[PDB]
Amino acid sequence: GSTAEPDLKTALKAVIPAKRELFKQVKERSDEVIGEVKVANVIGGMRGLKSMLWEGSVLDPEEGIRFHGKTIKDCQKELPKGTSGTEMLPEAMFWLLLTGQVPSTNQVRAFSRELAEQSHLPQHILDLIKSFPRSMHPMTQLSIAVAALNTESKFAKAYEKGLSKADYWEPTFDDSISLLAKIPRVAALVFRPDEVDQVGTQALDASQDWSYNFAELLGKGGKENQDFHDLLRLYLALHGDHEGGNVSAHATHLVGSALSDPFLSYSAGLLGLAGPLHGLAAQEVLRWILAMQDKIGTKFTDDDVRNYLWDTLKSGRVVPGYGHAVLRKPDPRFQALMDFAATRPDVLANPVFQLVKKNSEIAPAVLTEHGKTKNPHPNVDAASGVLFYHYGFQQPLYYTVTFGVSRALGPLVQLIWDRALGLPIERPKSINLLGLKK
Amino acid sequence: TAEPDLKTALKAVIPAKRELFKQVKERSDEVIGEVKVANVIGGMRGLKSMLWEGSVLDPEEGIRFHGKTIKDCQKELPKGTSGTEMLPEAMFWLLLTGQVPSTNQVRAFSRELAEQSHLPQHILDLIKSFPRSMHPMTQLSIAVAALNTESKFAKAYEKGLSKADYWEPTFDDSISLLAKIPRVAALVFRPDEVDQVGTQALDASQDWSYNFAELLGKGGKENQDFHDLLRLYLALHGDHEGGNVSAHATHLVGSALSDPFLSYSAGLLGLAGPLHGLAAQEVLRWILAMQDKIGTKFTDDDVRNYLWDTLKSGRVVPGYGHAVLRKPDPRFQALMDFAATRPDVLANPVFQLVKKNSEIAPAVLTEHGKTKNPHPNVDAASGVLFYHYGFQQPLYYTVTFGVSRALGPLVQLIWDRALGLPIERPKSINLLGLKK
Numbered sequence A: 001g002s003t004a005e006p007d008l009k010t011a012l013k014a015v016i017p018a019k020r021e022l023f024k025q026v027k028e029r030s031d032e033v034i035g036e037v038k039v040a041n042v043i044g045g046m047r048g049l050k051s052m053l054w055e056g057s058v059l060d061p062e063e064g065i066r067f068h069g070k071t072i073k074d075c076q077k078e079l080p081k082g083t084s085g086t087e088m089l090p091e092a093m094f095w096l097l098l099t100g101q102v103p104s105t106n107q108v109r110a111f112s113r114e115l116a117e118q119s120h121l122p123q124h125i126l127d128l129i130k131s132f133p134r135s136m137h138p139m140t141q142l143s144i145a146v147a148a149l150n151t152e153s154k155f156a157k158a159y160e161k162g163l164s165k166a167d168y169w170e171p172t173f174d175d176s177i178s179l180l181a182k183i184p185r186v187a188a189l190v191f192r193p194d195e196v197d198q199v200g201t202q203a204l205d206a207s208q209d210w211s212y213n214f215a216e217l218l219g220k221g222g223k224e225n226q227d228f229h230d231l232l233r234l235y236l237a238l239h240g241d242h243e244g245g246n247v248s249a250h251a252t253h254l255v256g257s258a259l260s261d262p263f264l265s266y267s268a269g270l271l272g273l274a275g276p277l278h279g280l281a282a283q284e285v286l287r288w289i290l291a292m293q294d295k296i297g298t299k300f301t302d303d304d305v306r307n308y309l310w311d312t313l314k315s316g317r318v319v320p321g322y323g324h325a326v327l328r329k330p331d332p333r334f335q336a337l338m339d340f341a342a343t344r345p346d347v348l349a350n351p352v353f354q355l356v357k358k359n360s361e362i363a364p365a366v367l368t369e370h371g372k373t374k375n376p377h378p379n380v381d382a383a384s385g386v387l388f389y390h391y392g393f394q395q396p397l398y399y400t401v402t403f404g405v406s407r408a409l410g411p412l413v414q415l416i417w418d419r420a421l422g423l424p425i426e427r428p429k430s431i432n433l434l435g436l437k438k
Numbered sequence B: 001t002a003e004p005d006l007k008t009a010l011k012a013v014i015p016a017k018r019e020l021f022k023q024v025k026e027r028s029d030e031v032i033g034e035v036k037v038a039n040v041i042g043g044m045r046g047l048k049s050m051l052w053e054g055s056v057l058d059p060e061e062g063i064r065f066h067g068k069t070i071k072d073c074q075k076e077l078p079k080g081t082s083g084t085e086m087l088p089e090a091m092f093w094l095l096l097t098g099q100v101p102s103t104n105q106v107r108a109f110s111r112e113l114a115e116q117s118h119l120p121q122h123i124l125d126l127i128k129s130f131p132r133s134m135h136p137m138t139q140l141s142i143a144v145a146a147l148n149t150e151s152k153f154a155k156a157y158e159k160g161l162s163k164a165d166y167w168e169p170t171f172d173d174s175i176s177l178l179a180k181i182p183r184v185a186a187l188v189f190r191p192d193e194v195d196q197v198g199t200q201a202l203d204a205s206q207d208w209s210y211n212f213a214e215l216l217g218k219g220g221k222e223n224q225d226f227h228d229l230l231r232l233y234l235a236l237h238g239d240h241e242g243g244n245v246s247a248h249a250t251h252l253v254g255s256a257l258s259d260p261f262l263s264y265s266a267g268l269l270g271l272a273g274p275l276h277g278l279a280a281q282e283v284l285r286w287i288l289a290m291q292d293k294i295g296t297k298f299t300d301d302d303v304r305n306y307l308w309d310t311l312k313s314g315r316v317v318p319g320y321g322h323a324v325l326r327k328p329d330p331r332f333q334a335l336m337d338f339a340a341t342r343p344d345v346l347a348n349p350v351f352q353l354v355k356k357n358s359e360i361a362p363a364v365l366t367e368h369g370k371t372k373n374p375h376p377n378v379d380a381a382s383g384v385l386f387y388h389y390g391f392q393q394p395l396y397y398t399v400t401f402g403v404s405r406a407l408g409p410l411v412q413l414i415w416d417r418a419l420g421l422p423i424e425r426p427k428s429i430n431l432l433g434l435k436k
């Protein structure tokens, strides 16, 4: 007889009927008015309009993101850690997002083993990646390679053969796990174009966690890189989900709603994450900080930072990494990253980190006095790029690739639930300016 | 001696649109609708929540393009140097500017599209890496994204571009993608001829549909009937307001300032879905499977039995239903009217089966009681007309839709950037939050 606790699919099966029951109850109230649509919502990219379902996370505009009601600090305490290190595992975060429950350490160990076993790639993906020119932006590469993995889609094949609507969730789950397992390897291939043959075939240690094995594929394996492993765990867990309305989450849900499989759907998500106003912001923050360091020097005072911020604003440009579309108060994800740095003397001594820290103390008041930026707290993008830079990722165009790995987590969870609940195609109505004029 | 070109014609109508936009924005606080639980749990169905300038879909009347019906466009838009069907590049002109171009203007724009059609070597190399198992829409989506190496917008933005000047590089990239996408599509159709098809000159005097046909191996005077089908087809599928998945995904990814190549790649990944553009492929597979089961000599009840088998199996009847339309789709009727004057098409047994199913399936769907619209959509009829003209692999049918559906969404990206529309970012909620 087996000794193991329930695996992830089994844990999911245990909670599907309860969610379907809740859905049925909500659907009885279909006709209830919950809001107003204004002209502003139409011309303003649906800002503030409650118009989509998302189960795993809810952004409290006053307190930051919660995952099934849990704060970041709650998850940091409760979720399992790796065999070494102190940071919460992203694969534990996935478990939580999907099931609504905190897994045991033993359950996470078993799930980590599955992810290691399912990480190999078809040879055509290696051929595809070798065809990319050096001029191709790393996010273009990543989006294409993920779409190309649709050759491996169980959902696409099952649907082509004739699949009942009731049976959509299971192959969606299977494809989601497959994509999760493979995406760090794909991302490593984007980072390491001269090592595609080795990185693309190397066996992972099946007893190590997803972030550790990503690090190994990036060339940062072993005990000497233990702090980087913990950075990566924390980073990947923090960026996994940020409710449904952000562009990458939304795009994934939207394309998935037409019953495109999870590889095509998350490829659309990645194309959104490649936008300057969404996932590329972390790349822009770090470029901006290095350009500030170049102009003010390393002897900088508070006044030098204040003057630089004012010059930036007087020039009609933004201070990147400050502000948010929805959250109006300090980002707990930002604080989590700064607290990771607090206990690492080598990071605290990095002059580029010291500049990020000082800027985070001074900028919010300057931005407030200026009055053009709403919600002028530092967001998580203020800190993430510098931490990667510290650990030797100093290629200006690659920072969003790691975000792409993380942001598979939440949107894939919602695709599984979308299919389990039977949600229909996302298809709103449009109107033209003439029609709004009356 | 030359009439205004497309960019110039666009520049002339931008100020009036910006004036209209300002007038609308003064009324930002006007309530125009209600959000209900149904809208949240039901994929935004019935929620009027996004802007789209070039077309507006009436649930009862079908699509209008700047207030014009399909029949209006068929009569008014310029034709090719041969044939009687409206040109898709004329449709693009109309969608973008709001004005019907002269024939001379269309001829000049067609020549630009032919000139801008060539592909860089790395795109040919990428395509030759595709395995034979790869679905044609996966191929098309990837190759379009890969063309982002050629994006003027992406490069200009990276260098520092003022918001007021976003539209011009967006326009330039849109035209580049339009010019290139039929050649990309032909490479998907012709995997063993990438080197030749990927470099061959287009006929500089011919229209966009003609040159697509030639790249597909259906050039010349002997294929003039097919060129007219293709013109009509490409024009009909160009735009269907903003809320369809491919249009919406293009707008959504574009709204984060991803360039037109990345944004329309996202559109194509949506168009690849069984409930959206892949339904054209799905229809013909289902029609052929029905023909195989019921035979050559069959009754109405044999067709009914096949429809009910599909429904009882938990599957959709492809080519029936629509998110917005509540009557038979006038794009469907335009394709059936194309067939109506061609005795060889009407006599094709696969066409006869599509026609018979269109007389039976709406009643079956009504009896079943799930669908809000039992009537045929355009996907019921498109694939069989390609089949008749010799395109007999249904896994490629959506690729031609991919070529057509660049037209409308690229127009809206240009206007999105000209007007300065912001990122699309709704708010979500969980079921527990709706229950409270």
Ligand SMILES: CC(C)(COP(=O)(O)OP(=O)(O)OC[C@H]1O[C@@H](n2cnc3c(N)ncnc32)[C@H](O)[C@@H]1OP(=O)(O)O)[C@@H](O)C(=O)NCCC(=O)NCCS
Residues within 6 Å of the ligand: A422, A424, A425, A427, B045, B274, B275, B276, B277, B279, B311, B315, B316, B317, B318, B319, B320, B321, B322, B323, B324, B370, B371, B372, B373, B377, B378, B379
């Ligand atoms: C076009 C389509 C996606 C619109 O979706 P929609 O707006 O959610 O459709 P409805 O409001 O009519 O859906 C209500 C129910 O009817 C079902 N239904 C709709 N069209 C159907 C069809 N053609 N065959 C079987 N069932 C259908 C839906 O799947 C849904 O099921 P549920 O309530 O049991 O969960 C849908 O009609 C469809 O799937 N059609 C077949 C695919 C197709 O032809 N697509 C191309 C459209 S141009």
Ligand SMILES: O=C([O-])CC(=O)C(=O)O
Residues within 6 Å of the ligand: A239, A242, A245, A246, A247, A325, B425
């Ligand atoms: O939430 C948003 O709108 C943007 C986002 O994904 C993030 O901040 O992680």
